[PDB]
Amino acid sequence: VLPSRRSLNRSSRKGFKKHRPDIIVIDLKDHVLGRAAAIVAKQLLLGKKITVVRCEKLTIAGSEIRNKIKYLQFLRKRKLSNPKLGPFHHRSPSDVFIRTVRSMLPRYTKRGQRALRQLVAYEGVPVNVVRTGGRVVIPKAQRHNCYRNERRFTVLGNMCKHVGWKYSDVVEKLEAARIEKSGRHHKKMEKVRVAWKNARKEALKKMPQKNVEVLKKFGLA
Amino acid sequence: SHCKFEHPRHGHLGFLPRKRSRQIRGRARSFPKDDPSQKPHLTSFMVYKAGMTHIVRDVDRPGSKVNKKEVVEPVTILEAPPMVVVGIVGYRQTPVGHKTIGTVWAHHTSVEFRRRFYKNWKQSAQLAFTKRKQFARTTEGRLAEARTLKAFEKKADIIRVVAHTQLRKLRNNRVGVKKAHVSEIQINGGTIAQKIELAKSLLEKEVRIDSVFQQSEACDVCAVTKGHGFTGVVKRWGVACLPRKTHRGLRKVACIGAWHPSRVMYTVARAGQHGYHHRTHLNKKIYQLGRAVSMEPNQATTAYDLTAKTITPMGGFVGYGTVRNDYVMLKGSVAGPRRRVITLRRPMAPQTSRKLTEKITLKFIDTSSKIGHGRFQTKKEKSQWYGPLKKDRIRR
RNA sequence: UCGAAUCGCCACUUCUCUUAUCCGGUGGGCUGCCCGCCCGGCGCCCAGUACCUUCAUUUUCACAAGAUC
RNA sequence: GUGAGAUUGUGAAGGGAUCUCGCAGGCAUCGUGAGGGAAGUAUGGGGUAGUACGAGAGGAACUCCCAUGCCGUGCCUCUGGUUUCUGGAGUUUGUCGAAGGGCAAGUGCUCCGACGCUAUCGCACGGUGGUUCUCGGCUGAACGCCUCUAAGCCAGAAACCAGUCCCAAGACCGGGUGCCCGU
RNA sequence: GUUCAUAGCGACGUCGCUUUUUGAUCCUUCGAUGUCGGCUCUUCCUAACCUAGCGCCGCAGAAGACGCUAAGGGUUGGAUUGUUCACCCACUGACAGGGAACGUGAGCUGGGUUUAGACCGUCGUGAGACAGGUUGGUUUUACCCUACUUGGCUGGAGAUUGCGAGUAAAAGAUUAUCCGCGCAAAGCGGAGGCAGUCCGUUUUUUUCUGGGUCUGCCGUUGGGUGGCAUGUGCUUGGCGCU
RNA sequence: GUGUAGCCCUCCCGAUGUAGACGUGGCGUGGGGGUGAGGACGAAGCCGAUGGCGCGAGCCUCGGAUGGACCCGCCUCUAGUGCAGAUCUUGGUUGGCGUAGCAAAGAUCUAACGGAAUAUUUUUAAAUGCAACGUUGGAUACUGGAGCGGGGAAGG
RNA sequence: GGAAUGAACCGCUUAGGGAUAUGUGGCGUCAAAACUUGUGGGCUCAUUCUCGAUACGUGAAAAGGGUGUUGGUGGAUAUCCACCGGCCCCGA
RNA sequence: AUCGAACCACCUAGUAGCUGGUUCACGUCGAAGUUUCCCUCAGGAUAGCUGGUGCUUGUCAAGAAGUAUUGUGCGGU
RNA sequence: UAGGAAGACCGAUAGCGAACAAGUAGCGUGAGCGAAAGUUUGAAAAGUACUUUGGAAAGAGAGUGACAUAGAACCUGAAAUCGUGACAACGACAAUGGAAGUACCUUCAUUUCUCGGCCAGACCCAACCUCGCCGCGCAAUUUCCUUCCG
Ligand SMILES: [Mg+2]
Ligand SMILES: [Mg+2]
Ligand SMILES: [Mg+2]
Ligand SMILES: [Mg+2]
Ligand SMILES: [Mg+2]
Ligand SMILES: [Mg+2]
Ligand SMILES: [Mg+2]
Ligand SMILES: [Mg+2]
Ligand SMILES: [Mg+2]
Ligand SMILES: [Mg+2]
Ligand SMILES: [Mg+2]
Ligand SMILES: [Mg+2]
Ligand SMILES: [Mg+2]
Ligand SMILES: [Mg+2]
Ligand SMILES: [Mg+2]
Ligand SMILES: [Mg+2]
Ligand SMILES: [Mg+2]
Ligand SMILES: [Mg+2]
Ligand SMILES: [Mg+2]
Ligand SMILES: [Mg+2]
Ligand SMILES: [Mg+2]
Ligand SMILES: [Mg+2]
Ligand SMILES: [Mg+2]
Ligand SMILES: [Mg+2]
Ligand SMILES: [Mg+2]
Ligand SMILES: [Mg+2]
Ligand SMILES: [Mg+2]
Ligand SMILES: [Mg+2]
Ligand SMILES: [Mg+2]
Ligand SMILES: [Mg+2]
Ligand SMILES: [Mg+2]
Ligand SMILES: [Mg+2]
Ligand SMILES: [Mg+2]
Ligand code: NA
Ligand code: NA
Ligand code: NA
Ligand code: NA
Ligand code: NA
């Protein structure tokens, strides 16, 4: 994915500087794992580019002990003759989500393999996607719309930590820094936000009165 | 049907595959856990194997049958010329592992270090590090170095130093390699700022083994074992031989699997490469830390044996020669043949047992010849047994 | 060298938390009702809501014959 | 566009047209670690102690200390085994005239024998944290009593997961660094 | 079971599980799937013999009985017999039960079973018979594909193509138009000058050029101070040189 | 005017199928009787990213930088008349494959000569002509008189 | 054409092709259809062969139990007893 | 190189209810594994199921019907 | 033993075993068994003198002949299998196959070139098939609606 010299010369000759394709960034905090994967799988097949973040905050219905036992039963399956050929049991939350999505795709055709290549999964919000725009959610897979309040659920990050994931503390430290850095900057840049709101209110007093009457009729000001 | 009688399986399945080691030098895969309370210090060293001998000492072990009595213990002698520190590296932690941040190089480096980056040094242009030398000390070069050191302080997690051996000072006739061996040594203890301060003071300087290890301490050994080439199942795995009347040979495994599954499994012994594997062994006590013979010649003289002698046996170590530099005496054996490069590291397992904390006081060191049955400790002793010989008569 | 498919962008979006929750926050009076108080944006044809000015013969659809990289 | 080539079935110049390939990396080092493998396990003695308990008869165990069995990873200082160093010596038959030096008997045979390889027949070494099961409890309703359970919490098996250990980027590392080349 | 149905048992009855016994059937194989046992080697199951932790007793202690989680580890040396099975001697913490084409013959062995020679008993007029006893009786082929064990060579992200552009990177005239400190702050620091040329839609325009020059710095001429493990490179301090 | 390149135009009802039966102005091959053509300005045969026609068996055209002397359409007669397999017959070719191997009877060395078998380079000597053969002299060693000694029979 | 898979089950039975509509079976992704339909009711929480979920297909299960939770019937008193169902749990 | 009956040529292409094979296209139709007899049970003959050729006729229906209704008989699950 | 007539016969794996130095070569102690093989170059040997490399075999030229890719067991010269030049791409589903398109070739067939038998779009008539909008009949709408009191 690192550009070669050939790409650099071609871009320099034609005067191309930067390019960003159309990508949707999904915040997967407090989303149901199975329902989020099913919706994402169909959109990938329709030709969308999707990047998901905060995969460690996905939720699964049931107690943690029940889901932990479920994973351990999966870990027991291996090719006895040569386990290095057998099924591979990935342990990170982003790898678990990618495996779940892969099971909902035609993975043994070129069309299915291409669709899987269009998905990128992260733990937390990495520095290269922080400033890329506003994140989105999936209302049909949100926890407060799917589970009854009295049921018990499992957070994917806590489940993975006890079956082999080794970077739970690293992700937690990185998230704390990001919240501090983003919170400071958003406390800044408030004077400009207030100034812009004040300018709009100062308008409707200098702008033509006929256009003000139209705005009132349509309920805009 | 079940097997008629039970016995434990042959061999350890955690040391697979039994393939040739990728490198010939011993490399530590992990370093001891960092303790920020202690002072910054190095954690490993590189030495060369010379040979073996044995010693006599008195043991202090209450409740034992040998308490306050003499024992004989074989030991291993390893030559340890001082190392040179040339670089600093820093690491940062990411959700996918550790990543290198950058490298700070020393301004002056020796020819033996720069020999490592060439296949034919004497017939090349020898241009390595020439451009960096022209730029490092300028105003822009100083600014670039400060930028890298600022990155180390701000966001690094682990600090390591790049060091190399001095084969020129180890004037061995049988070790043919002239390019130095390069490795990384982690710095443990103190904060990140204190770690960097120690590394800068160490740049372009020598480090002696006595400043890393102490006598009566334990250590870990990383080395590659002796090779044996293609080997049968009897030697490779230790299976039992078959009766004498066996058609088509008896040094085999009779049954290599059942009908189902219809394939051979990875747990069955087969013939292949044996030896030349990387191994890490634990808890080797340090019996002596000797200094170079040029400074103090009475290396093998103890408080109970006043004979003046060096550590090299009569006639020299077989296939190695003389020990001319600092050395370390380890109890027991270490992997690999003579002349191989071996890495010693600080212990990983807890060190609190009575055996591990015992204080060692040597009483006798053997220096007889390892060729034949040596019966003279020194050259003077042999010339006292024999009188003047025929050749001496010619001289006088 | 290359003729190519893609056709919103922002240094107001590009911080956080909740849903048994003051749906912007936050008090008082007598369960629940009543009464208070303070505070996404642009973009679609004049760089701006005036009514000034060039568009053709590419003469009835055809990948926008134009843009971006 | 440019640099190379090709257009091979009934002959030779010359021109044209078209079709293919190249137009950017190379070598050398220090590292990361997803995934896979996975290992240590038992007994005895000292002391507790002739103690607890028991009318007597009899009769235990934990911290701690010292060894050993089975297994695993290595090594050759010592001891033992092995000799085509045909090393040194000795000895039989034949043979070069004798002696000397040898030689033939697919290594004549005997003794000692280095280097190397090798034996529990010799020697060294074999770690750290969590989640839980059975079970025992704490608060506590349902059910103005009670209750280890309904919500919640504690401690916790040779079991399970990770660390240490072995292979390791078809796990395609936008990890670092050195020099040459190109833009 | 001194009493006491249920510590431990449990008749008369009744409900199940398993495929490690033997039967019942005859679906596949008769232009052939090598038929007992032992040796060797790996793995799986739990209905737990020993090893870890527990509950309960007709558990005072010691030794034990019953039950729960648990298959990580261990489970022997011999006499007789072809034996599986059986039965004794001995050690031990313990000498648990089973599966994998009744695991395993192009891995072995060939004692037994089941050809041809021969002896005995019983049966048959006889040739001969006996799931009765006995002795002697050729064990063939891998260089192919896969699996497994080691051993090397080498491409490749549109997983060989597209030019089909997503960094677990930075932080701004849209990353361009310099650096250092600082919180994506507030704020505060440093920066050589002169002449041409060659190109140019403006803001002290881009380059290329020339001397005059001043730091940091190379390679140097020699000189003396010194450190390092002491033949080889450094730190000094000047000289004239980019 | 059963059956076609169906005499032509409307309308209605059925259409699969093992063993098996039957139909076809249904296809193809060797030869006889008739009729009509073709060929050195090139017959049969053979080759094909040569297309066209037919549901199909097949038919026809094109090209040959192939060939060198015969052959076909239509109506009828006649038969040794159509192939993918029979552990089918006879030839040819084939992966395995430069593979498995060419391992009893002890063994050869050296100089000169001979030989086309060298001392073979244009683009100092070694790193660019290797390997192997016979005779003679010398060396080493085997057969060891029940001999890789010297003569005969049978057989040749 | 359906029941993932199957000679015999379900639907339907077949000249070469379009348009329209159905049968059996379905409408979270694989995979066409409720881009997870209703402005419809209830019931269920199930720790190592892991609650349950398309008949034929026994092609996985009993006797006997539960103060789990949700409904009935018959008696008593200003809540108590006896009996019978649904789903789930032990037996496994 | 042959022996619980040698070798060569011939009768001999010996017989086989048993195993193997059996060469172009389209179209109209399209089954049976059941009955009786057979030294019959891995085979035949015989009736049934099928194809071909028709004959005699009719055209809304004769000697039509795997179906009802009405009337009248039979029966021992 | 001499001759004649022929054939809806076979046409070199056929026809006699034998179209040829065939009951021959070869096999078996013997009685006996028993093949393969068209010399079919060309009308005519005119069967390649001579130069050059090579020890030779042969190669490169030259020549005869209408043709030598008719060069000597030489007419025609198929398939199986192999080499070479150019090109097409291609992961690992063993290949092969069916259906429907597309990207590059091919220049095979047919049509057209001032009218076209080519490619699109809109409009008109008939037929068939949909959607909007507006409604009706019936004691179905009295186990009902409303007011007041008990
Ligand atoms: Mg066992
Ligand atoms: Mg044998
Ligand atoms: Mg020695
Ligand atoms: Mg792991
Ligand atoms: Mg594992
Ligand atoms: Mg000798
Ligand atoms: Mg001799
Ligand atoms: Mg000896
Ligand atoms: Mg068979
Ligand atoms: Mg067989
Ligand atoms: Mg077999
Ligand atoms: Mg069985
Ligand atoms: Mg068996
Ligand atoms: Mg066998
Ligand atoms: Mg056997
Ligand atoms: Mg076998
Ligand atoms: Mg016998
Ligand atoms: Mg039909
Ligand atoms: Mg048929
Ligand atoms: Mg004929
Ligand atoms: Mg025939
Ligand atoms: Mg044929
Ligand atoms: Mg070979
Ligand atoms: Mg051999
Ligand atoms: Mg001899
Ligand atoms: Mg001799
Ligand atoms: Mg769909
Ligand atoms: Mg016949
Ligand atoms: Mg047949
Ligand atoms: Mg029909
Ligand atoms: Mg009869
Ligand atoms: Mg013939
Ligand atoms: Mg020819
Ligand atoms: Na044998
Ligand atoms: Na159990
Ligand atoms: Na002789
Ligand atoms: Na049959
Ligand atoms: Na013949």
Side-chain angles (χ1 to χ4, degrees):
Chain A
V1 302
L2 169 70
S4 55
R5 306 226 274 210
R6 198 203 298 261
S7 283
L8 295 168
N9 325 330
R10 184 184 167 279
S11 295
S12 311
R13 287 170 27 219
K14 305 183 101 73
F16 297 151
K17 289 165 30 183
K18 76 134 280 183
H19 176 266
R20 166 104 179 160
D22 227 306
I23 297 162
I24 302 148
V25 185
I26 300 183
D27 194 350
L28 278 188
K29 161 160 180 293
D30 276 335
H31 281 52
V32 178
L33 165 83
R35 307 183 171 262
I39 291 162
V40 163
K42 167 55 74 177
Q43 288 315 120
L44 285 173
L45 282 165
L46 287 179
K48 253 72 159 69
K49 291 173 203 292
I50 289 160
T51 298
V52 296
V53 298
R54 299 230 269 186
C55 281
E56 83 272 359
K57 318 284 259 197
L58 280 160
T59 66
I60 319 173
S63 62
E64 191 171 47
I65 175 66
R66 167 178 188 83
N67 292 120
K68 226 176 304 172
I69 282 165
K70 196 164 314 301
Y71 194 90
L72 293 176
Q73 281 288 103
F74 165 63
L75 182 58
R76 270 191 21 93
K77 277 136 193 68
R78 62 171 206 166
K79 171 150 204 196
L80 184 64
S81 300
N82 213 3
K84 80 151 70 78
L85 308 167
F88 306 128
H89 321 91
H90 295 253
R91 257 90 152 182
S92 85
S94 38
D95 275 14
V96 166
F97 180 77
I98 281 177
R99 179 102 173 185
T100 303
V101 167
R102 180 173 137 253
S103 291
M104 308 183 177
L105 286 175
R107 72 213 70 99
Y108 298 121
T109 65
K110 282 194 187 165
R111 167 176 175 248
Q113 279 142 41
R114 165 105 290 270
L116 187 65
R117 202 101 39 180
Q118 294 195 321
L119 171 76
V120 176
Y122 290 116
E123 274 104 29
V125 184
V127 292
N128 59 315
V129 313
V130 152
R131 285 206 220 172
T132 36
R135 264 93 70 196
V136 308
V137 295
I138 316 168
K140 273 141 95 143
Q142 298 206 271
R143 213 232 304 148
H144 71 279
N145 289 340
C146 289
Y147 296 162
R148 289 231 167 271
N149 287 31
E150 304 86 32
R151 300 295 175 195
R152 297 284 179 245
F153 55 90
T154 303
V155 181
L156 194 55
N158 296 355
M159 197 219 63
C160 288
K161 168 188 183 186
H162 297 311
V163 294
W165 194 35
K166 299 193 277 191
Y167 302 98
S168 42
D169 287 351
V170 185
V171 171
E172 184 53 83
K173 237 176 71 148
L174 288 176
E175 274 314 277
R178 169 184 87 77
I179 302 308
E180 210 30 50
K181 192 161 151 52
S182 279
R184 260 200 321 269
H185 182 255
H186 186 271
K187 197 38 208 73
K188 200 183 279 145
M189 287 279 285
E190 166 179 311
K191 41 183 75 67
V192 47
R193 283 199 309 266
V194 168
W196 272 120
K197 290 180 152 63
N198 273 342
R200 274 199 286 285
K201 194 207 284 203
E202 186 36 274
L204 322 157
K205 274 175 288 153
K206 330 270 208 83
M207 82 179 266
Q209 280 320 115
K210 288 146 303 323
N211 293 349
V212 142
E213 211 65 69
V214 175
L215 285 188
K216 251 130 57 187
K217 133 165 73 153
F218 273 103
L220 270 275
Chain B
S1 202
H2 68 277
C3 67
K4 193 149 209 76
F5 298 107
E6 311 257 2
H7 71 80
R9 71 152 287 119
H10 296 290
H12 195 306
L13 280 179
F15 289 100
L16 294 184
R18 313 270 205 91
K19 80 188 282 294
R20 290 173 197 172
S21 193
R22 180 173 66 83
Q23 312 173 330
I24 196 169
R25 66 164 163 114
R27 184 185 42 102
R29 272 85 169 121
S30 277
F31 291 100
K33 161 200 252 229
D34 201 319
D35 181 359
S37 83
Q38 325 189 247
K39 281 182 64 273
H41 59 281
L42 300 189
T43 55
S44 56
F45 213 88
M46 290 217 268
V47 297
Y48 295 82
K49 181 173 180 173
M52 283 188 81
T53 180
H54 67 266
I55 51 100
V56 176
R57 80 180 187 86
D58 210 346
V59 304
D60 158 80
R61 185 175 312 152
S64 173
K65 229 167 291 287
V66 288
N67 192 28
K68 313 196 316 321
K69 284 189 175 4
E70 319 224 274
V71 301
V72 175
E73 313 250 49
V75 295
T76 309
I77 308 296
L78 309 139
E79 205 163 6
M83 300 183 91
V84 179
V85 164
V86 297
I88 310 170
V89 289
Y91 289 88
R92 67 195 180 88
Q93 176 69 280
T94 74
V96 295
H98 281 103
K99 279 176 186 175
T100 320
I101 303 170
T103 316
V104 176
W105 288 113
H107 197 44
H108 307 101
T109 54
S110 68
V111 165
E112 35 184 12
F113 168 69
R114 307 199 306 270
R115 266 175 170 269
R116 174 54 69 178
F117 310 111
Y118 287 97
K119 243 70 191 163
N120 200 340
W121 161 263
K122 302 269 302 197
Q123 288 188 5
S124 70
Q126 307 162 356
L127 289 168
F129 285 86
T130 39
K131 284 281 192 59
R132 194 194 171 89
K133 180 165 201 171
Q134 231 69 240
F135 161 77
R137 239 50 158 181
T138 73
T139 87
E140 263 63 43
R142 292 195 196 272
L143 287 176
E145 165 187 49
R147 262 175 220 124
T148 291
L149 286 174
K150 164 117 170 294
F152 281 5
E153 157 134 23
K154 217 130 193 81
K155 70 180 47 142
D157 168 359
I158 300 169
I159 295 294
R160 296 199 204 156
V161 284
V162 170
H164 74 87
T165 61
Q166 306 200 88
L167 289 159
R168 217 207 316 260
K169 294 200 160 304
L170 177 114
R171 348 186 64 90
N172 196 260
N173 288 112
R174 305 309 303 286
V175 165
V177 51
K178 283 169 182 165
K179 36 164 77 161
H181 292 106
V182 195
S183 89
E184 283 186 9
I185 305 170
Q186 192 163 296
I187 293 165
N188 277 351
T191 69
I192 298 290
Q194 288 167 328
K195 294 185 207 277
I196 294 167
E197 212 45 90
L198 175 70
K200 280 232 281 303
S201 87
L202 278 193
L203 252 197
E204 217 174 315
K205 282 198 171 353
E206 280 188 348
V207 184
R208 285 171 93 160
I209 193 154
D210 63 50
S211 75
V212 179
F213 289 106
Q214 298 283 273
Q215 210 255 341
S216 279
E217 262 193 1
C219 79
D220 282 346
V221 175
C222 317
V224 183
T225 67
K226 295 164 67 173
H228 294 110
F230 209 90
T231 310
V233 294
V234 163
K235 177 173 198 178
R236 200 182 191 213
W237 291 95
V239 307
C241 281
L242 297 167
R244 186 203 53 90
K245 322 174 56 162
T246 309
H247 190 44
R248 293 197 206 91
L250 50 97
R251 284 174 80 82
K252 285 134 132 205
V253 164
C255 173
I256 66 169
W259 196 320
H260 285 110
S262 306
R263 51 204 174 268
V264 184
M265 316 223 278
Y266 76 102
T267 55
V268 177
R270 318 235 73 188
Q273 164 85 26
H274 184 53
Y276 203 69
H277 312 313
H278 185 277
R279 293 292 179 265
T280 297
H281 293 148
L282 300 195
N283 295 337
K284 306 283 186 177
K285 295 269 305 201
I286 298 189
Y287 272 10
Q288 195 188 145
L289 279 177
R291 340 210 64 238
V293 70
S294 340
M295 312 193 194
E296 306 121 359
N298 294 343
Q299 301 174 318
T301 295
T302 84
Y304 310 69
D305 196 39
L306 288 320
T307 300
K309 26 188 252 186
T310 77
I311 208 61
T312 306
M314 257 180 111
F317 283 115
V318 181
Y320 185 86
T322 317
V323 176
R324 307 166 158 96
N325 317 99
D326 298 340
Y327 67 93
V328 52
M329 179 190 300
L330 283 196
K331 174 194 177 179
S333 58
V334 300
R338 68 247 184 160
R339 313 200 279 262
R340 196 163 272 176
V341 48
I342 292 164
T343 294
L344 312 177
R345 87 172 177 202
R346 303 199 57 82
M348 217 93 177
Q351 311 279 309
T352 50
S353 149
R354 286 209 196 166
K355 215 169 78 133
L356 265 334
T357 53
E358 190 186 0
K359 212 223 163 303
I360 309 303
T361 324
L362 299 182
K363 199 154 291 206
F364 165 83
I365 296 172
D366 190 82
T367 42
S368 59
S369 99
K370 308 309 170 196
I371 296 162
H373 289 238
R375 62 179 184 102
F376 303 112
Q377 288 305 308
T378 57
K379 226 159 289 303
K380 215 197 75 200
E381 182 180 356
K382 171 170 174 174
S383 89
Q384 267 176 358
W385 174 277
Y386 297 98
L389 287 182
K390 166 184 249 211
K391 330 286 316 203
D392 309 25
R393 228 209 190 291
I394 309 306
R395 263 201 254 290
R396 183 58 228 152

